[PDB]
Design a protein around this ligand. Structure first.
Ligand SMILES: Nc1ncnc2c1ncn2[C@@H]1O[C@@H](COP(=O)(O)OP(=O)(O)OP(=O)(O)OP(=O)(O)OC[C@@H]2O[C@@H](n3cnc4c(N)ncnc43)[C@H](O)[C@H]2O)[C@H](O)[C@H]1O
Ligand SMILES: Nc1ncnc2c1ncn2[C@@H]1O[C@@H](COP(=O)(O)OP(=O)(O)OP(=O)(O)OP(=O)(O)OC[C@@H]2O[C@@H](n3cnc4c(N)ncnc43)[C@H](O)[C@H]2O)[C@H](O)[C@H]1O
Lengths: 530, 530
């Protein structure tokens, strides 16, 4: 239970993100990222960089965003990629059908005039909605009778609005095109030279961190439903017969909630299995697909998301994307309900065969006499955009003080800046002290900023606290007069401070940030400080 | 004098960059970046990050790429942003007028049937071409008589083809739009909250590193003329009366070539002045504008560009961009002729007033009773795309060996990876040696890779050399048998190797890379090694 009001405010006011073209109304689905937003956004992508590109030796490439029609035609996006959009025959007013109807019953079932009878099946319609194809979706629009959420007029019938953007490369129009809704298409169109790198063998994974434009229909969800976002997609290319990952055991232990395709049509709550097990019972197919799920879960933990509001729901027989057959998602419970943050498909051999075909060009690899195979790609797609947002809710807190102060609890690995050094007075009796302390941290690799904004030591930290800043070091007179020189080490969450000598602090904020010492351990080694 | 053939090849073959949608023909102006390309591209942006955002405390923000018409209408892009495009009335075939004509005379003057007479003025037409407005450009198309470079048909008349891309945000078309051809527009539309950060004072600079789409007409220049590129733009906001930079003295010494607006209409060669001087004589207006020129020059040096093929040419009275009045460029001499890599405008108060107007919203700052001013922005725009390319030529070399090997000479600060450790045999008598050496480097922060590709120690380095890899460490038997254990330290450029004990090497590759020791100094401290 989080409070959107007080956060969307604290966020926007502290310029994490805010509506683009503000001074023009602001196009919905389009938001900009201020400084502390960028600092956070870069720290999330710099972690995601270790966690994957580093650890698993991932081949990186930066592909163009401007795509020519033929390429998206072959993948079959020009076709099946879109959302059902209706609209009241009064004025234009669009609406992603899907959701509109999902809001109708969420009004009936919630209204107390419901029959313990009805209520139980409208749930059976919601939990089966992404499945409903063109027809059933057209029908249901008659039944429950849908009518514009604003001034209830009469919505036309459900239609397939393609989400891709559209433009022409070069002058004229002989070369129409689109704005790549996903990155991968590029990782594949490059397959040959990407195979090349890994000596022609498999497994070998590729990747890309960049933009993807998705002209949504009714962007009303804030940072969750945007028309342009930064996402990172990995294209793990493994043998169709070797679907057995050489590391899986490092992530089988993990006990993550799972909500199989059966635990859905078999209307039952998700379970908190184990991975080494969930794969046993035939649920999570092979092991590769389970390993990435393990990592995907560690990253999401490491960056902020909390164990409790994260689950993995496989799709439904035809809730499938046009390019896959199997597939799992990382859904994060939030004020908008469970939403996916890290889609993880299993698009067997689709994409690669479709392209090799249409271009009459050969796309294969070989194994040991030596047979040719079409690798089976397993794509773990991350939408940093939403991943950041989940981190914002899961860590938002309101300190218990009538004052109404707020502090985010970001892991030291993503906070705008780890430590925030602050002295009382700004004279030369403090400088030769503050100076050192900054460089000494610099050396230790503890990202920081020296506090200048005036206010009581305590009001100063209210600011440091709002943007999640991990730790703080208070440098008062006693640090500049008493000898040894002791400073104040304050843990953002507990506002509890420590008093340690000043030249030892940098190595302390370090061990603290890296997860090489608890806050409790400090209170135990050094003296407290109310 | 560089050789495009042998490089465009070595580049593309080593997947630095290559045509996008290869297996489809490849849309010109659109290229992708392979791994060693990305590694280089990221190292250039990570340097540019220190050099500017770090040093000058630059406020960063990440703005959207999708822009709604009204915003680009107010800046006046919907109007004056474009290139003159003709086309032979036979078939479509476009052509940026500008250049087509510039290729015609570059054929007349070069053809030996020229009069020492004519030749001298066609130069007077080329050196004054960006100036020629709609008319004179229409006229000259009659004179010199321009006719399609391919199957000389008859080109229509010169017209204003707007370069911006075009699309509709949301379903319908009630909200048309474009793909931001530059970033800044965003930095301005955010002015208010950006002022806020710096306590409402000036100077204070903003910035953005991201994409910009520029639907060129005849992308035929490779990586130099692309339809989509990553660029970084800084928006330094200083007082219209304080145009005097608080650091300029740190960059006045520098002796960089300058080619004033007068040294152009006064048809005379560029000069190799000094900055503290060039500003004296009234050429380079104030000092801010000169400081950034100093930095802009250091970065371009630090990353690769060579002093000699870099100059700064101010624009011509009406070669101006629609948003500026004064302006300098960083042109880099290359196989395509001097081309600009780092545009540096002085767009006084244009952009900010235009927006504050159209939106009826107030955009100002105050100084000490306390008057309101419209800061004067000074924009240093970097096109990493072309900056990378200049680095590719300026450092391409062919080792003197009939064999035809090539090695780039990237400053250790941008090479795919600094050191490249390589052992002969792959057994356990080498591991406990290679292992250490990697971590020991890891600790020292010397990005590296262990050589696996088979071949003679020497053929191995041919590879390390092609992608510019800074240094190499050869680990042979004598390192694993003789004691002390000595390795081989090889300097990419001179192929000259050193023999030093192995546990001391990591700190050596370090000092070497950081510019804290010459290669000569090694040959002096340690023993050689043919
Ligand atoms: N029977 C059927 N036939 C055809 N289509 C059917 C169908 N049933 C359901 N559908 C679905 O309806 C469409 C709705 O798409 P979307 O509008 O993109 O939203 P989504 O389904 O909630 O995310 P998705 O799961 O598609 O993300 P993706 O794999 O592309 O890529 C990964 C995601 O990218 C990011 N992302 C996607 N959209 C985003 C947005 N608008 N804002 C921010 N991030 C976004 C997410 O963070 C990340 O998880 C889907 O394309 C299609 O699968
Ligand atoms: N009288 C007149 N009236 C109106 N317009 C006139 C004119 N006389 C000349 N012109 C010029 O004609 C147009 C040609 O533009 P472009 O097609 O973008 O090429 P340019 O002039 O060589 O680069 P420019 O100097 O414009 O780069 P910019 O400041 O935008 O931004 C910085 C640059 O971005 C990068 N960049 C720009 N285009 C690139 C491309 N196609 N590929 C790669 N990088 C590019 C460069 O690296 C970097 O220096 C210019 O917009 C306009 O000024």
């Amino acid at each position: 239970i989080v409070d959107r009001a007080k956060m969307e405010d604290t966020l926007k006011r502290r310029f994490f993100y805010d509506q683009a073209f503000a001074i023009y109304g602001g196009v919905s689905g389009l938001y900009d990222f201020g400084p502390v937003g960028c600092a956070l956004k870069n720290n999330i992508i710099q972690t995601w960089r270790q966690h994957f590109i580093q650890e698993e030796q991932i081949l990186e490439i930066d592909c163009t965003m401007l795509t020519p029609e033929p390429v998206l035609k072959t993948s079959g996006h020009v076709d099946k990629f879109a959302d059902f959009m209706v609209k009241d025959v009064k004025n234009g007013e669009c609406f992603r059908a899907d959701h509109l109807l999902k809001a109708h019953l969420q009004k009936l079932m919630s209204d107390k005039k419901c029959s313990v009878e009805k209520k139980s099946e409208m749930e059976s319609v919601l939990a089966q909605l992404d499945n409903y194809g063109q027809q059933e979706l057209a029908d249901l629009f008659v039944n429950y009778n849908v009518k514009s959420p604003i001034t209830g007029n009469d919505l036309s019938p459900p239609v397939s609005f393609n989400l891709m953007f559209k433009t022409f490369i070069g002058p004229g129009g002989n070369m129409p095109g689109y704005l790549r809704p996903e990155t991968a298409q590029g990782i594949f169109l490059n397959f040959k030279r990407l195979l090349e790198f890994n000596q022609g063998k498999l497994p070998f994974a590729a990747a890309q961190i960049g933009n993807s434009f998705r002209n949504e229909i009714s962007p009303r969800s804030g940072l969750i439903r945007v028309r342009e976002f930064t996402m990172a997609e990995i294209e793990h290319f493994v043998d169709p017969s070797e679907k057995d990952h050489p590391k899986f055991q490092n992530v089988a232990d993990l006990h993550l909630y799972l909500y199989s395709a059966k635990a859905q049509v078999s209307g039952q709550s998700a379970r908190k299995m184990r991975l080494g097990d969930a794969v046993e019972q035939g649920v999570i197919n092979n092991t590769v697909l389970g390993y990435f799920i393990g990592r995907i879960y560690l990253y999401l933990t490491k960056v902020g998301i909390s164990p409790d509001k994260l689950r993995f729901r496989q799709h439904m027989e035809n809730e499938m994307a046009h390019y896959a057959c199997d597939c799992w998602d990382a859904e994060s419970k939030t004020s908008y309900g469970w939403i996916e943050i890290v889609g993880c498909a299993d698009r067997s051999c689709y994409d690669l065969s479709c392209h090799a075909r249409a271009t009459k060009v050969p796309l294969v690899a070989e194994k040991p006499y030596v047979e040719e195979v079409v690798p089976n790609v397993i794509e773990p797609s991350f939408g940093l955009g939403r991943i950041m947002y989940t981190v914002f809710e899961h860590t938002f807190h309101v300190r218990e003080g009538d004052e109404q102060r707020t502090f985010f609890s970001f892991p030291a690995v993503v906070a705008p800046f780890k430590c925030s050094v602050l002295p009382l007075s700004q004279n030369q009796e403090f400088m030769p002290f503050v100076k050192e302390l900054s460089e000494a941290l610099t050396r230790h690799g503890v990202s920081h900023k020296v506090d200048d904004s005036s206010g009581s030591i305590g009001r100063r930290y209210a600011r440091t606290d709002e943007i999640g800043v991990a730790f703080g070091v208070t440098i008062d007179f006693d640090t500049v007069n008493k000898t040894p020189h002791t400073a104040t080490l304050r843990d953002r969450d507990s506002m509890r401070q420590i008093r340690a000598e000043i030249s030892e602090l940098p190595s302390i904020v370090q061990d603290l940030a890296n997860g090489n010492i608890t806050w409790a351990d400090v209170e135990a080694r050094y003296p407290l400080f109310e």
